[PDB]
Amino acid sequence: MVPISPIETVPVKLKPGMDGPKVKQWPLTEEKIKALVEICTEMEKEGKISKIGPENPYNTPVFAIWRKLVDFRELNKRTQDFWEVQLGIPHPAGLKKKKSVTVLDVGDAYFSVPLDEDFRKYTAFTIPSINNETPGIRYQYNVLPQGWKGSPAIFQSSMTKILEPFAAQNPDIVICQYMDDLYVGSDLEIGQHRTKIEELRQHLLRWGLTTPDKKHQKEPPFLWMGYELHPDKWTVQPIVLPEKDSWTVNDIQKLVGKLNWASQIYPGIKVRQLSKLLRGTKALTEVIPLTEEAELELAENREILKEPVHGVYYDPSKDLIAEIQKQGQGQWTYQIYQEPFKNLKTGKYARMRGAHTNDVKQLTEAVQKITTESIVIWGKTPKFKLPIQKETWETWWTEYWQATWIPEWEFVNTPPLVKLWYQLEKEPIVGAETFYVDGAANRETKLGKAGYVTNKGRQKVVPLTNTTNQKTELQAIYLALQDSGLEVNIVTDSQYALGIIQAQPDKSESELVNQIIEQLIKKEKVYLAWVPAHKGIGGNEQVDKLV
Amino acid sequence: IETVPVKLKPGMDGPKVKQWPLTEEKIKALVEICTEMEKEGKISKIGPENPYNTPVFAIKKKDSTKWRKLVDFRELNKRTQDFWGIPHPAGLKKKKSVTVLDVGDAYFSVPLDEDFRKYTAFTIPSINNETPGIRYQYNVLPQGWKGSPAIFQSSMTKILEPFKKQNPDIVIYQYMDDLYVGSDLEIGQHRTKIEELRQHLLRWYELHPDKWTVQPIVLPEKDSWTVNDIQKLVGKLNWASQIYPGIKVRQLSKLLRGTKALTEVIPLTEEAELELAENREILKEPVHGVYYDPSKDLIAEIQKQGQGQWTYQIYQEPFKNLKTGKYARMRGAHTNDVKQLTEAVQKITTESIVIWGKTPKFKLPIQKETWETWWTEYWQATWIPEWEFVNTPPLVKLWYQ
Ligand SMILES: Cc1c(Oc2ccccc2OCCn2ccc(=O)[nH]c2=O)cc(Cl)c2ccc(C#N)cc12
Numbered sequence: 001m002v003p004i005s006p007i008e009t010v011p012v013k014l015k016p017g018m019d020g021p022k023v024k025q026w027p028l029t030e031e032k033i034k035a036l037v038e039i040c041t042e043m044e045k046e047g048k049i050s051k052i053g054p055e056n057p058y059n060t061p062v063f064a065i066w067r068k069l070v071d072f073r074e075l076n077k078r079t080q081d082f083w084e085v086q087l088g089i090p091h092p093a094g095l096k097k098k099k100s101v102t103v104l105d106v107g108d109a110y111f112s113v114p115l116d117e118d119f120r121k122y123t124a125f126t127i128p129s130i131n132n133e134t135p136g137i138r139y140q141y142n143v144l145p146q147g148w149k150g151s152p153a154i155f156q157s158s159m160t161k162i163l164e165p166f167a168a169q170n171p172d173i174v175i176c177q178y179m180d181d182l183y184v185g186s187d188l189e190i191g192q193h194r195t196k197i198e199e200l201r202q203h204l205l206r207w208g209l210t211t212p213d214k215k216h217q218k219e220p221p222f223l224w225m226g227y228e229l230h231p232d233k234w235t236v237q238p239i240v241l242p243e244k245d246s247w248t249v250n251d252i253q254k255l256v257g258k259l260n261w262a263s264q265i266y267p268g269i270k271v272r273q274l275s276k277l278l279r280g281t282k283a284l285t286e287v288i289p290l291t292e293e294a295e296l297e298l299a300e301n302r303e304i305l306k307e308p309v310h311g312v313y314y315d316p317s318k319d320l321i322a323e324i325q326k327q328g329q330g331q332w333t334y335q336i337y338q339e340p341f342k343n344l345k346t347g348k349y350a351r352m353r354g355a356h357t358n359d360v361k362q363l364t365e366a367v368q369k370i371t372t373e374s375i376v377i378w379g380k381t382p383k384f385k386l387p388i389q390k391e392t393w394e395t396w397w398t399e400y401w402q403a404t405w406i407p408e409w410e411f412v413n414t415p416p417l418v419k420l421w422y423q424l425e426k427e428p429i430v431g432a433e434t435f436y437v438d439g440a441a442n443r444e445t446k447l448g449k450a451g452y453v454t455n456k457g458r459q460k461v462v463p464l465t466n467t468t469n470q471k472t473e474l475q476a477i478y479l480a481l482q483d484s485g486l487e488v489n490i491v492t493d494s495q496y497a498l499g500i501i502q503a504q505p506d507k508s509e510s511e512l513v514n515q516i517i518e519q520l521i522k523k524e525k526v527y528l529a530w531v532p533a534h535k536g537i538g539g540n541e542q543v544d545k546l547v
Numbered sequence: 548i549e550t551v552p553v554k555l556k557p558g559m560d561g562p563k564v565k566q567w568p569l570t571e572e573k574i575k576a577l578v579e580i581c582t583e584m585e586k587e588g589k590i591s592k593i594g595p596e597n598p599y600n601t602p603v604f605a606i607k608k609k610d611s612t613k614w615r616k617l618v619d620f621r622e623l624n625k626r627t628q629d630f631w632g633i634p635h636p637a638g639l640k641k642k643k644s645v646t647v648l649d650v651g652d653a654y655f656s657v658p659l660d661e662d663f664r665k666y667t668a669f670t671i672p673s674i675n676n677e678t679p680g681i682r683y684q685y686n687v688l689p690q691g692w693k694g695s696p697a698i699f700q701s702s703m704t705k706i707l708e709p710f711k712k713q714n715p716d717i718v719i720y721q722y723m724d725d726l727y728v729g730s731d732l733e734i735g736q737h738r739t740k741i742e743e744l745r746q747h748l749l750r751w752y753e754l755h756p757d758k759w760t761v762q763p764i765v766l767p768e769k770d771s772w773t774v775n776d777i778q779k780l781v782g783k784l785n786w787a788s789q790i791y792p793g794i795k796v797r798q799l800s801k802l803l804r805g806t807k808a809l810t811e812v813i814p815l816t817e818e819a820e821l822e823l824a825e826n827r828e829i830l831k832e833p834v835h836g837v838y839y840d841p842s843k844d845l846i847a848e849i850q851k852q853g854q855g856q857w858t859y860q861i862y863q864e865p866f867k868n869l870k871t872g873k874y875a876r877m878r879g880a881h882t883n884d885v886k887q888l889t890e891a892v893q894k895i896t897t898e899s900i901v902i903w904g905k906t907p908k909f910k911l912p913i914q915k916e917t918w919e920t921w922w923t924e925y926w927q928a929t930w931i932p933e934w935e936f937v938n939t940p941p942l943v944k945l946w947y948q
Contacts, residue, residue, distance in 0.1 A: 011596055012596060079596035082598055083598050083600070085679040085680055090677055092679075094674065094675035115928060154595055156595065157594050157595045160679055174677075175678075176677045176678065177677075292553065324844050334930045361914075364914075364917065365916055368920045375570055376674075376676075377677070378674065379569075379570055379571035379574065379675070380571060381570070382572055397884060398853065401850075401944065402914065402940075403884035403885055403887070403912055403917070404884055404913070404917055405917065410886075427775075427811035430776045430810045432804070433808075434807070436928050455806050464781040489808075489809045492780070498942065499940060499942075503939070503940060529775065530782065531778050532781065532782055535785060535797075535800050536797060536801065537806075538804030538805045539805065539806040
């Protein structure tokens, strides 16, 4: 017998202060008992488990469904934390095209790796005897159990350690490692490739790891994790959108998830109108109707999901390009490609939850997202094609109070173009009328007044019902904008209004703010000055709106 | 050669911080560096029984193309037990010139406590999750860890003992992987003395604190004042009255009586000139009751003034500034706001280290996502301060300009 190489065990401990699991074994039928006896007998013969004495005080429940099922949940609660690296999965758009590609699934993955002997006594379980008239048959694991917390991490590290020298000795191939699977790829001739695969599974066999001996059980196209991997292209598995005249919150969540999944290769997917209905969640049972916006959006989604679209694979020798389009209502869509009309992948971005916003900020955020995603998938930042003029971005970042930056990018003229809708003056305007504005409200009656006095003698005060100080302060400015010429100086003591306007929004959740914006857009020059309130500053008439 | 037992704080488990994505060149750099370090026993590969993780990335220091490895030990630092204390040299900030040296390599000689090594675990990530990350843990004292200078304090003392005995006029301070050397010599003599000290450290950044002081609140001096000028002046004085007790604005506000055009010139009354004068005299004096409390955090606020100009204030209690300044240095960041901000944060942190011997918590005028995306690309320091993000434009911007 050729001595199979030994796999060094991983030292495992329990969580501090805890002890091994001790759970009462469930009563099983005579049939189930016989089945488990046969199975565990065979396993014991194979060396996966071993009989133990009555000394072992720990026990884990076992069931039969024949296939056995050891419920390690309590042990999983008592087992230490392990380093999971499985967070994130390989994205098809990141894969570099190879002439030949092989998939190997290891058989008896966990049962091929030895368990730390000092930990084996915590994996003990008992098979109930017939009529329970004899002491139940006692067993413990000698290898990694299916369903245990530490099994994936240990198996993964073991596989990595085993694979390292082969990979080092074969730089002309690439090996991707994912759970119980290995994915090898090379640009070699098919014969050399099959040869190297045979060498690989031989090398794995040296450590006692079994691979498909026949023609490998999986050949292209590969269906994996919702993806379809083809020799020259990739896509997603076909979409399934349920149709019912009565939608629940859970169905909304599933639909949203599926649309999101479809959006990574299908361009133009929108999910806003359907996501707005997820307000007041945690109630999975409900009947929520659909608006015309939502219905048209979903119909348009079916329209896009009508015909199949494929993404290509990554080529490191060509540049990486990301192009962005504005879709409206805080929605953005983007394509990542290298050759025209051949997307590596697609995606979308939705604006955050805010009271005020503008297009430039949203485009910026979208750029950050695409940048991070691209660094994950391809390990580099793509060159950007943005629907914004160079001079627009220039003016923005040069005059913006916050620091901001966009990586290398160029202007692409595909409307609607992101633009700056208004620009406040930095100095007072000569020859322009000066509106001193003010507003005030009563906290109890919610009655207020908003208005202005100007240097030409123009005056106005409007009485308001159901309002606040902030609302009247905005309203005054709005009045001044309404009644002034194309150029106007405005004086306010409202740090609130000044804050809002200095944040530079182009759209708002407040109708009043939006109207103010609409006024600002129509203006040629606006200078907005601030003064302290109640400081006896003439012009600033707090007493005119407090009557 | 003898390991000193190091533990964590009572009731605190090791750091478990997600590694953020890295570009391919940084990954390759870290692969080479960590391979070489592994061949030197400085680090060792670890199994999955180690659940702890600390982020890691790659940078490029000043005047060097060589990639350097930086570990973000912030979480481990705050989870690492308090090491005890050497009183901060209050004369370091008073010295004419100070030079900063990198004594990080010296840490790689001293071995780290075995039982503590599992807490310094880090991961080199792979692109597109194609393979699991390469995991390491430190065997020697890691750079960036707060325990490293504390442990090496005795050694550093024994090493610098002859030099300190030689020049009693030269102040030597240490923070993290850096050694601050202050004196009053000449730049040439300074550089030669630095070569002397570095070759003294071999066989075993010109910074001038004097050219940096605290900044006063100034008021405009005009022959003619517009309504706008007086309004801004009144705003600034009202603001400053939160800091200075005797500031009054009634005689200046008295001038604004009536609804006048903003550009209209208003002559100052004698009472107004008097009031303005008294306000100047008041502002010329230092702030009342401003003390430093080593038990409290230092807070640093930064404002973007535009055209490469940035202002900053370090305080503990609002309106009680311990330091103020204006970084306007242009160094290959003309088109990049984030690079400028990053360099500003580094300089302010450095000054903070020189003055108080600890780092301030920053309030950055930048969106979290932007900063988080780009700040590592321009970072050149071995330490990393704490920060938070201000999303509302502060009115006090032009009052520091
Ligand atoms: C099969 C294959 C891979 O293959 C590759 C393995 C190593 C290096 C490069 C690879 O692919 C580059 C792109 N590509 C892809 C498929 C193909 O047929 N041809 C081709 O060129 C890579 C991955 Cl993540 C896979 C993940 C899951 C499954 C399954 N089931 C199979 C995979």
